[PDB]
Amino acid sequence: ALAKRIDAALIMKDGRVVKGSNFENLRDSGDPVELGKFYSEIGIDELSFWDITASVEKRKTMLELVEKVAEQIDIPFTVGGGIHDFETASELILRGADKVEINTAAVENPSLITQIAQTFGSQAVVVYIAAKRVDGEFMVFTYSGKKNTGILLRDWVVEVEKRGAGEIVLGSIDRLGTKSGYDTEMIRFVRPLTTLPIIAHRGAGKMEHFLEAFLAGADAAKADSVFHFREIDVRELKEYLKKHGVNVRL
After folding, report:
1. How many angstroms separate the CA atoms of 60 and 11, rounded?
2. Exposure of 59 by Cβ count < 10 A (0-12 exposed, 13-18 middle, 19+ buried)?
3. Distance CA 131, CA 152 (A)
4. Could you give all domains of the chain from N- to C-terminal order, each with its CATH number?
5. I need a surface site. Which of 85, 157, 219, 232 has the fewest CB within 10 A?
């Protein structure tokens, strides 16, 4: 029925893919640009490039990345990782990114969502929401899961749409590092609260997990290590989803 998207996320530091990948056909399996390009050719629909360059080289590193990526790939991509204000987001979109992915800076200043959207459109703004169960409630976490904001997921989802975001990535900290499946309970919780596309993140271990996420109401599903270490083949995944009635691009 409804069209569904398959996303790959690449974690990057100092220009390199953190922990690389298992694609031996590649000249450089740790080159984010070559790996991204390869993904774009075998069936990934959209890419996310996440930078954790901790040095003062971060800003130009991310700019050089988006420029090289835009030159080599022809599917939409998002860039993220410590994007804290409008000028940083703007530089990155102009240099070639289709979208920016923001989290902590958005929670601390939700008007940042609106400021990026008012120049680049809602479709250019993706808000990543890291959430976790705490005393029986879904709470929003910031600073790479270090801080419980005390903000209810329910309230933040509604505010994010109100401020003009285009898409929500819903990352379950309750599933980080696990391969037991996406947090379908969390996706089902968020689905009726927003009209925005919901992208599932964290927990994927096998093809059937993607099917479960789409049944839960996700519009897209994003993963990283399961692709890079080839626990799941992307072509096989889309073939599988299509076979069982999911509207994926094949």
Report:
1. 17
2. middle
3. 9
4. 1-250 (3.20.20.70)
5. 85
